[PDB]
Scaffold this active site. Structure first.
Site, PDB file in Angstrom:
ATOM      1  N   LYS A   1      -8.930   3.178  -1.752  1.00  0.00           N
ATOM      2  CA  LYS A   1      -8.422   3.318  -0.388  1.00  0.00           C
ATOM      3  C   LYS A   1      -8.658   4.717   0.162  1.00  0.00           C
ATOM      4  O   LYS A   1      -8.294   5.009   1.302  1.00  0.00           O
ATOM      5  CB  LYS A   1      -6.930   3.000  -0.357  1.00  0.00           C
ATOM      6  CG  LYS A   1      -6.610   1.604  -0.851  1.00  0.00           C
ATOM      7  CD  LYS A   1      -5.117   1.385  -0.967  1.00  0.00           C
ATOM      8  CE  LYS A   1      -4.824   0.027  -1.580  1.00  0.00           C
ATOM      9  NZ  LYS A   1      -3.407  -0.380  -1.378  1.00  0.00           N
TER      10      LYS A   1
ATOM     11  N   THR B   1       0.872  -1.212   0.000  1.00  0.00           N
ATOM     12  CA  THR B   1       0.000   0.000   0.000  1.00  0.00           C
ATOM     13  C   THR B   1       0.893   1.241   0.000  1.00  0.00           C
ATOM     14  O   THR B   1       1.884   1.310   0.726  1.00  0.00           O
ATOM     15  CB  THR B   1      -0.980   0.020   1.195  1.00  0.00           C
ATOM     16  OG1 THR B   1      -2.016  -0.937   0.944  1.00  0.00           O
ATOM     17  CG2 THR B   1      -1.687   1.374   1.368  1.00  0.00           C
ATOM     18  N   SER B   2       0.531   2.200  -0.842  1.00  0.00           N
ATOM     19  CA  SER B   2       1.194   3.490  -0.890  1.00  0.00           C
ATOM     20  C   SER B   2       0.131   4.568  -0.800  1.00  0.00           C
ATOM     21  O   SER B   2      -0.641   4.769  -1.737  1.00  0.00           O
ATOM     22  CB  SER B   2       1.989   3.631  -2.186  1.00  0.00           C
ATOM     23  OG  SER B   2       2.972   2.613  -2.273  1.00  0.00           O
TER      24      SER B   2
ATOM     25  N   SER C   1       3.196   0.198   3.122  1.00  0.00           N
ATOM     26  CA  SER C   1       4.445  -0.519   2.876  1.00  0.00           C
ATOM     27  C   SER C   1       5.345   0.189   1.862  1.00  0.00           C
ATOM     28  O   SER C   1       6.567   0.193   2.010  1.00  0.00           O
ATOM     29  CB  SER C   1       4.149  -1.943   2.402  1.00  0.00           C
ATOM     30  OG  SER C   1       3.222  -1.938   1.332  1.00  0.00           O
TER      31      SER C   1
END
Ligand SMILES: *[B]([O])([O])[C]([C][C]([C])[C])[N]C(=O)[C]([C]C1=[C][C]=[C][C]=[C]1)[N]C(=O)C1=[C]N=[C][C]=N1
Ligand SMILES: *[B]([O])([O])[C]([C][C]([C])[C])[N]C(=O)[C]([C]C1=[C][C]=[C][C]=[C]1)[N]C(=O)C1=[C]N=[C][C]=N1
Ligand SMILES: *[B]([O])([O])[C]([C][C]([C])[C])[N]C(=O)[C]([C]C1=[C][C]=[C][C]=[C]1)[N]C(=O)C1=[C]N=[C][C]=N1
Ligand SMILES: *[B]([O])([O])[C]([C][C]([C])[C])[N]C(=O)[C]([C]C1=[C][C]=[C][C]=[C]1)[N]C(=O)C1=[C]N=[C][C]=N1
Ligand SMILES: [Cl-]
Ligand SMILES: [Cl-]
Ligand SMILES: [Mg+2]
Ligand SMILES: [Mg+2]
Ligand SMILES: [Mg+2]
Ligand SMILES: [Mg+2]
Lengths: 195, 212, 204, 222, 196, 233, 222, 195, 196
Positions: free
Chosen positions: I33, I1-2, I129
């Protein structure tokens, strides 16, 4: 195996050893002799892990018999006990140690003295007036502490040994099927056939 | 720990050692392993010091409340069962207790109950409890009779503890003696093992393996 | 399980004025079970004395080993080994088993035959030398022995005074240890006489 | 244990405390933690006592033989290399943590070795349980271009920081000074804070206090 | 640890921080992680200090013996010796090494050897715990055939950020320049690179 | 039972002749990541107390709110809230110390090490420590984490015992604190150059200094260090 | 995993005289190899001529002392300001400790004072409440060093009368407060030498019919 | 505890239960009666974990005695066995289960039939002609398979029970110190004092 | 995930990738998201999808009920409700949330709430992450009071690199713009951002 006792009196050493062989849930035999004659005046009883006990005893027996033939001479009980201790002390740091505890009862013909040695699987040797391996000592040493003398006769030794076996038969959970008793003195080794 | 108690002609003999350990460290040689619940009841202590002490003095409070409510001395059976029922509630929690509830009543006579932290409650004539129980059993079983004099019975109990004090590393210090009769218990002194050993050895002719 | 505390036992050594003392208990057990009350832990090779605590089979083995080595030393050197030299021999011999050690706590005591200087030394199970001036302790009641020695000990004691100090150190330390006691022996060592005394103590 | 090394302009100084411990118990109140590898190469050691003594003597032996073979004064980098390759071989199981110092024909040197075989270089270093107390002092008072007298003080001040503030460190301060051109001076118990204090009492016993069972003369003679 | 090696027009530059840690304690704040295996073949070390020293020492020995027999070795050859040790002893080692060298024929070359023992020839390489934080920056800012001054700035800025975010990285920024001209050592202190 | 996530390192402090000093860096670490660079870990309570907190930051923010709430609650039906019945350092500490031990006894601790620094009503210096286990102790110098190992030795050279306190001035004390903070920046891998420092004096009151930096650092000698033994270049 | 227990070191000592009692304890407080405080009082006056110390894990020690002090306060409220006798306090403490039988106060508790006949009294507790009146008791880290010394020098164990050779014991003569304080000081000086957690300072609380008096002595700070 | 046997013959149920109580290494008692009378014509023997055995047996006993008084009527063996099974089946999913195995021997006065029920600690009930708990069955079921009949007399049942006990005394490792034998028939419950 | 949120002159912009993974399998490649807890208070979600959805749903409920009683809540208030849930249930949650909102009084605000349940008000925030790889880039390129177009480019470039290096990140780059003008949704596909 289970119970092995030893007592050194005035003129002899008496070894008592249980007759039971129990492999798990069943008692496979009730007449097993847990001892080997190492020399005419030296007897060794033994108890520990299955297989190892007999394998060790017979290995020691062979070595002492080889010595006897080579020198045409019987080793002293002290000398035999020291040889046995060294083998066990060598064994404890092996890949697979001998899991065997022994009593060595001998009559020294040179000194005219009975001698009892207690040696465990680690190679821990002690000379004693009376000895035991496993849980036997927990019951029997109190009786022997009370009743024992250095000047006892062989018959008195046997009576004191009966009192030990009776106590064991009363308080121990396992049925060890009685004991085979053997006497070691100046005339050699003999078995008490009624006990 | 070695504690024993046995029934005979002259009532009950109770004998205990005095040692308390924490591993190999001897924490105390002056422990009172007998509790005087009342003038007729005794309790022996083996295992966890705190567990035995706490719950046996608590037992005394329950026994007192009984005779206040019922105007009658509590039976040894009822007293022992109060303790066993209590520890059974705590079963699994980790209490560590090995006790003998000894006493005398008219209806029961001299009575001994073995009470255990596992919930075991047993009536019997002879009991030895603790790490040195096996040593004590040897002497007791070979010398016990119903027809023993208060004097000889007292000595046997004293001697059986001595036997255990010698051989068992976690037993020793001194010997406390009690004698329980129709008219209650009677203390028979603290006997230091350091003096008792040599005395017995000399007079009895025993312990010939040791040198003195 | 812990090899150093299966059999039990203790050794202590002290220096005095032109003398040394080394003492030990006589107990050998199998954990709680007492087995022997004649198991001495002090040996001597010539005038050099060695006390050994710990696992009994190794105590016996090392004695036999150092007898072996000191006997050959004497045949070749044409003289008895000295305490300082024997100390180095004990250290060497223990460290050669660095990753399979003897579970012992040796203590060397003696007087150098040439200089007359009193000498004591202690070791861990793998060879580290503790060469103390005052005293050395070893065994299952070493904590107790440290406390007794540190409070009772004073320097330059005479042989017969040193005997009282070391005996009381051992006795009272053993009486606070479940695996020590069952008798005791004290060696008083002077440059050309050695006295061995068996102590009367409680047998529990 | 607190051990320390400090370089100065014409040499190097080493220092250590004198306590040895089994857990919380003090085994030796005056352990010598400074070792001679060669006459002008000394090392201070922390960790497993037997390992520091043994690995220091082994390499000291090989250095002596090497010196004789090559007909030269031994170098500090030689000790350093021999030590680290040995410690590496045993993957840290030989618990020796060392500060190696000395002077040789190349100059004066100061190094450290960890049990796994890693080496470091510096002007000031410290190892052991008291290493953090000592390094705090060193990081506060170190400057470059120290004199022999300043460096000894800095080193012994660093060792004191461990003695007072670290429970694994105590008692006395040992020092060794390796100067270029000079003999090395080993200063055993360079600092002794003053002592034990007299005991309120004497516990010398009345003769006959201890009960005896048997006596005998021991035959030590042939 | 924050280490990197970057090829440029005139050759290659190695860069590294100077922090060695035992947990959160900085055992050495002035470490030299740029080590020499040959005159113009150096390496950057990350991971176990003991392992990477032992390896580097063995490599230096191999290349010294190579030189005595066959003359100056290539950078590729040096990387192969590193690889052989790291690959064959992968179970017992924890070493992340970047090999960088200068030939006259091949010019500046960079090889990275991560944990497994694999080899990767690259224009530039980054490694060590602090490298994670500058993958984005370095990818965006790297150019081929940079000048010496541009490459020094690139490494200085990159390691500055790696140090800023990684607790295992810090101290001074050491650099080693490898060109035909020779070998130049550079150093950059906190007061300089922190304000970037 | 938990594990700390976002953490704060050492808090250092010492007594001096007229009061106490306390300091702590402005970093909030996330494991090896130096994540948050503007975290205030010194929290003043009134004008006579400063609580320095290390360890888990989320628990710190919780404690910060308890203290804020404590001030509010003390003011309730209290005409002497800014005078005789104002919060003392000893009151604030004991409250925290109660909470810390209660939380450890529920096996759900506040993962912190706390130092309460302040000056009492009678002008006495207050300095006491409490942590996640509810363990409490007082000393002329107190430090948490790495500070215990590195700062205390330095600060104890200034105030080695109670009798050294009256001989120690605020300039000497602050100098020792600022030096210790530098040493921790050299040696603590989870420290930052930026920090806050607070002085609580019985005469001049509470002086709260923000945005301080470690300066006068020695690094030049690094240029001379080459290789790890044999290397010369 | 969270470990709710810790070890703060320290050592305490209680000796009962004929008409007095002492309870001593060092003032050092530690974790691992670090000193927290060189002067952190460990022995407390709890009122009604009773002194108390709960050695081991300081958080549990402080909690227990705090609760017992509170028990004394409420004993006065509930029973018409009646004085809490030392035997009554001992039994009360047993219940405090055993109340946490399954999550113990990790401490060795000792109290000292006078019994109802005016004689010196010392009571010793284990962590889960078992207790016993004693003449002599050391507790804590260096208890194993001190108790044997006290068996020898307070109860004259293994000591006999010269000339008789083991037949007649050394008679158990009573000790004065001056004599006891000498044994206490020598005990703590010896303990400080061979135990790393013991040092800094010694604080003794003496209890007589007149009240509770304090004495302080320095110990080595290494 | 250890060995408990049951055998249902023509007109009665016979329960045999060992006398030994062994707590670890020592045999504390050799005259323990591992049984409780639930009602005049219903007997329950038991074996399992220490404490739980007696606590459970007496709890059941009390409940059945309470029922008897309330209704002035004796529950059938089947009804008692079902009550006992349910308690154990409830128990097995409790915080701390009763670790107790039981045999229920009863004479149904309505049907004029002996009845033997074997129930384990899980609440597993089976009606049998002969039953056992623990390792006893491993030795004894082969003998009972061979020698048993539904029309055997009480005396024949006792002789067959002696043969079971003899086999156990020969082959089992533990000394269980003999058995107490009890007979349940139309006239109630009685103990065989010589066995 | 960014994920990231960035304040700028006119307000705040939230940004996120669209990859959801079960190990190495991409369970959803078009995930959103960026979720809405109020008209102009949104959040970025990282960690457990179940936990972060459950939390966001509860927060939306709390702010809806807040609005009914007390009117529009502040962004700080929204962050406090997130914090309260994340902190009090820290043993049973795995949620890393960035809260971003626009007031007229306070303008654009960004609060980050990492694993522990702590709150941190920042000019911009990055998480997930893939954030590890762009700490260096984002620190170097972020400026305060950027324009809308500059901020979109900053987020686009930053998440582009995060996606490039992180296997847990990918798909499209979603963005949500929060200003006085209203709420604008943006999307950027691989072909656009990969060539940056
Ligand atoms: B005895 O050994 O059972 C004894 C009886 C108790 C009343 C003092 N118990 C102990 O010695 C136990 C340890 C133990 C040893 C051997 C078997 C079982 C238990 N000690 C303690 O309970 C204890 C209490 N306070 C301080 C130290 N130890
Ligand atoms: B110091 O802490 O580094 C110190 C160094 C000096 C004594 C050589 N070390 C020790 O004192 C070690 C600590 C230690 C204990 C147990 C395992 C490993 C290390 N002591 C010893 O090695 C030691 C010395 N004598 C007897 C027993 N142990
Ligand atoms: B760097 O952090 O990777 C660094 C490079 C090394 C060549 C100096 N390694 C270390 O600092 C390592 C620990 C480590 C940290 C981070 C990742 C991997 C490893 N330290 C050591 O090897 C070390 C520490 N203390 C003493 C000796 N060696
Ligand atoms: B991102 O990778 O953190 C992402 C954010 C989420 C809000 C969609 N999380 C996931 O993809 C997680 C796994 C994960 C990956 C990396 C770090 C932390 C967590 N996936 C799930 O929660 C998931 C996966 N498959 C089905 C359902 N939920
Ligand atoms: Cl390195
Ligand atoms: Cl989702
Ligand atoms: Mg004993
Ligand atoms: Mg110290
Ligand atoms: Mg069944
Ligand atoms: Mg991707």
């Amino acid at each position: 195996m289970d119970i092995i006792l030893g007592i050194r009196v005035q003129d002899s050493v008496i070894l008592a050893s249980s007759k039971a062989v129990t492999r798990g849930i069943s008692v496979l035999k009730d007449s097993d002799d847990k001892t080997r004659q190492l020399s005419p005046h030296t007897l060794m009883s033994f108890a520990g892990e299955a297989g190892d006990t007999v394998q060790f005893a017979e290995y020691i027996q062979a070595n002492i018999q080889l010595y006897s033939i080579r020198e045409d001479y019987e080793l002293s009980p002290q000398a035999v006990s020291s040889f046995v201790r060294q083998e066990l002390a060598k064994s404890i740091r092996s890949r697979r140690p001998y899991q065997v505890n022994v009593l060595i009862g001998g009559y020294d013909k040179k000194k005219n003295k009975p001698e009892l040695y207690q040696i465990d699987y680690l190679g821990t040797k002690v000379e004693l007036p009376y000895g035991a391996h496993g849980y036997s000592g927990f019951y029997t040493f109190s009786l022997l502490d009370h009743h024992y003398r250095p000047d006892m006769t062989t018959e008195e030794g046997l009576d004191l040994l009966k009192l030990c076996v009776q106590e064991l038969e009363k308080r121990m959970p396992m049925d060890f099927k009685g004991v085979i008793v053997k006497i070691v003195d100046k005339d050699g080794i003999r078995q008490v056939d009624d006990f | 720990t070695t504690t024993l108690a046995f029934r005979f002609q002259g009532g009950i003999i109770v004998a205990v050692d005095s040692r308390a350990t924490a591993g190999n460290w001897v924490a105390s040689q002056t422990v009172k392993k007998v509790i005087e619940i009342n003038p007729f009841l005794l309790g022996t202590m083996a295992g966890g010091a705190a567990d035995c002490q706490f719950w046996e003095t608590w037992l005394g409070s329950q026994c007192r409340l009984h005779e206040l409510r019922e105007k009658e001395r509590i039976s040894v059976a009822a007293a022992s069962k109060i303790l066993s029922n209590l520890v059974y509630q705590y079963k699994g929690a980790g209490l560590s207790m090995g006790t003998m509830i000894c006493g005398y009543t008219r209806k029961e006579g001299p009575t001994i109950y073995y009470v255990d932290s596992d919930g075991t409650r047993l009536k019997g004539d002879i009991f030895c409890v603790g790490s040195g129980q096996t040593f004590a059993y040897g002497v007791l079983d070979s010398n016990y009779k119903w027809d023993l004099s208060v004097e000889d019975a007292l000595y046997l109990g004293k001697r059986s503890i001595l036997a255990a004090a010698h051989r068992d590393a976690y037993s020793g210090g001194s010997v406390n003696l009690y004698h329980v009769t129709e008219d209650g218990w009677i203390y028979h002194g603290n006997h230091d093992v350091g003096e008792l050993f040599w005395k017995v050895k000399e007079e009895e002719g025993s312990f010939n393996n040791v040198i003195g | 399980s812990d090899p150093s505390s299966i059999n039990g036992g203790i050794v202590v050594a002290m220096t005095g004025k032109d003398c040394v003392a080394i003492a030990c208990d006589l107990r050998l057990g199998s954990q709680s079970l007492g087995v022997s009350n004649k198991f001495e832990k002090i040996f001597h090779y010539g005038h050099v004395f060695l006390g050994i605590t710990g696992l009994a089979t190794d105590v016996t083995t090392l004695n036999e080993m150092f007898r072996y080595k000191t006997n050959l030393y004497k045949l070749k050197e044409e003289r008895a080994i000295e305490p300082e030299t024997f100390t180095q021999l004990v250290s060497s011999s223990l460290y050669e088993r660095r990753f399979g050690p003897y579970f012992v706590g040796p203590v060397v005591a003696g007087i150098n035959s040439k200089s007359g200087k009193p000498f004591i030394a202690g070791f861990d199970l793998i060879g580290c030398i503790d060469e103390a001036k005052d005293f050395i302790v070893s065994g299952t009641a070493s904590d107790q022995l440290f406390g007794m020695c540190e409070s009772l000990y004073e320097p330059n004691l005479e042989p017969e005074d040193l005997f009282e100090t070391i005996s009381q150190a051992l006795l009272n330390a053993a009486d606070r240890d479940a695996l020590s006691g069952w008798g005791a022996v004290v060696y008083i060592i002077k440059k050309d006489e050695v006295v061995k005394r068996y102590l009367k103590m409680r047998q529990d | 244990t607190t051990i320390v090394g400090v370089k100065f302009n014409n040499g190097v100084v080493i220092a250590a405390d004198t306590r040895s411990t089994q857990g919380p118990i003090v085994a030796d109140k005056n352990c010598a933690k400074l070792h001679r590898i060669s006459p002008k190469i000394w090392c201070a050691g922390a960790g497993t006592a037997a390992d520091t003594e043994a690995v220091t003597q082994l390499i000291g032996s090989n250095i002596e033989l090497h010196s004789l073979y090559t007909s030269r004064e031994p170098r500090v980098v030689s000790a350093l290399q021999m030590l680290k390759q040995h410690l590496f071989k045993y993957q840290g199981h030989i618990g020796a943590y060392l500060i190696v110092a000395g002077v040789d024909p190349t100059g004066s040197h100061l190094f450290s070795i960890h049990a796994h075989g890693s080496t470091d270089v510096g002007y000031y270093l410290s190892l052991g349980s008291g290493s953090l107390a000592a390094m705090a002092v060193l990081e506060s008072h170190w400057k470059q271009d120290l004199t022999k007298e300043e460096a000894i003080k800095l080193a012994s001040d660093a060792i004191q920081a461990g003695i007072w503030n670290d429970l694994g460190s105590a008692s006395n301060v040992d020092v060794c000074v390796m100067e270029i051109g000079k003999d090395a001076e080993y200063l055993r118990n360079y600092l002794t804070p003053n002592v034990r204090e007299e005991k309120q009492k004497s516990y010398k016993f009345p003769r006959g206090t201890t009960a005896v069972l048997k006596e005998s003369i021991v035959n030590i003679c042939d | 640890t924050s280490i990197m090696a970057v090829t440029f027009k005139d050759g290659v530059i190695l860069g590294a921080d100077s922090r060695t840690t035992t947990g959160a304690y900085i055992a050495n704040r002035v470490t030299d992680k740029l080590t020499r295996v040959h005159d113009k073949i150096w390496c950057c070390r990350s991971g176990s200090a003991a392992d990477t020293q032992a390896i580097a020492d063995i490599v230096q020995y191999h290349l010294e013996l190579y030189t005595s027999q066959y003359g100056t070795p290539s950078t590729e050859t040096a990387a192969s010796v590193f690889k052989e040790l790291c690959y064959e002893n992968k179970d017992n080692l924890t070493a992340g090494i970047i090999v960088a060298g200068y030939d006259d024929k091949n010019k500046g070359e960079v090889y990275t050897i991560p944990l497994g023992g694999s080899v990767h020839k690259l224009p530039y390489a980054i490694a060590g715990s602090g490298s994670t934080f500058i993958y984005g920056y370095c990818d965006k800012n790297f150019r081929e055939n940079m000048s010496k001054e541009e490459t020094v700035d690139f490494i200085k800025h990159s390691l500055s950020q790696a140090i800023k975010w990684d607790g295992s990285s810090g101290g001074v920024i050491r650099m080693v320049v490898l060109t035909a001209a020779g070998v130049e050592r550079l150093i950059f202190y906190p007061d300089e690179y922190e304000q970037l | 039972t938990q594990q700390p996530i976002v953490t704060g390192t050492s808090v250092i402090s010492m007594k001096y002749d007229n009061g106490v000093i306390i300091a702590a860096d402005n970093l909030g670490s996330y494991g090896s990541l130096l994540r948050f660079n503007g975290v205030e870990r010194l929290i003043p309570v009134g004008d006579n107390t400063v609580v320095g907190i290390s360890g888990d930051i989320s628990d710190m923010q919780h404690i910060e709110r308890l203290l804020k709430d404590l001030v509010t609650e003390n003011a309730y039906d209290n005409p002497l809230a800014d005078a005789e019945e104002a919060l003392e350092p000893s009151y604030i500490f004991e409250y925290l110390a109660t909470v810390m031990y209660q939380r450890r006894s529920k096996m759900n601790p506040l993962w912190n090490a706390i130092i309460v620094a302040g000056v009492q009503s009678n002008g006495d210096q207050f300095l006491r420590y409490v942590n996640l286990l509810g363990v409490t102790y007082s000393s002329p110098t107190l430090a948490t984490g790495f500070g215990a190992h590195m700062a205390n030795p330095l600060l104890r050279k200034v105030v080695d015992r109670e009798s050294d306190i009256p001989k120690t001035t605020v300039q000497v004390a602050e100098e020792a604190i600022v030096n210790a903070m530098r040493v921790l920046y050299y040696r603590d891998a989870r420290s930052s150059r930026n920090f806050s420092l607070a002085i609580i004096d019985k005469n001049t009151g509470l002086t709260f200094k923000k945005n301080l930096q470690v300066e006068n650092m020695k690094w030049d000698f690094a240029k001379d260090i080459k290789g790890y033994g044999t290397q010369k270049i | 995993q969270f470990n709710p227990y810790g070890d703060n070191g320290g050592t305490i000592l209680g000796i009962a005289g004929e008409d007095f009692a002492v309870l001593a304890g060092d003032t050092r407080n530690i974790t691992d190899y670090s000193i927290n405080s060189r002067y952190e009082p460990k022995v407390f006056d709890c009122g009604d001529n009773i002194v108390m110390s709960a050695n081991g894990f300081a958080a549990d020690g402080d909690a227990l002392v705090k609760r017992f002090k509170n028990s004394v306060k409420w004993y006065h409220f509930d029973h018409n300001d009646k004085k809490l006798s030392i035997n009554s306090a001992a039994r009360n403490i047993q219940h405090l400790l055993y109340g946490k039988r399954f999550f113990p106060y990790y401490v060795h508790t000792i109290i000292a004072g006078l019994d109802e006949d005016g004689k010196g009294a010392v009571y010793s507790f284990d962590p889960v409440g078992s207790y016993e009146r004693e003449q002599c008791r050391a507790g804590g880290a260096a208890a194993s060093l001190i108790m044997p010394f006290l068996d020898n020098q307070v109860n004259f164990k293994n000591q006999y009368e010269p000339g008789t050779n083991g037949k007649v014991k050394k008679p158990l003569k009573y000790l004065s407060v001056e004599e006891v304080i000498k044994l206490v000081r020598d005990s703590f000086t010896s303990a400080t030498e061979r135990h790393i957690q013991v040092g800094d300072g010694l604080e003794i609380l003496i209890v007589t019919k007149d009240g509770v008096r304090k004495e302080f002595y320095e110990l080595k700070r290494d």
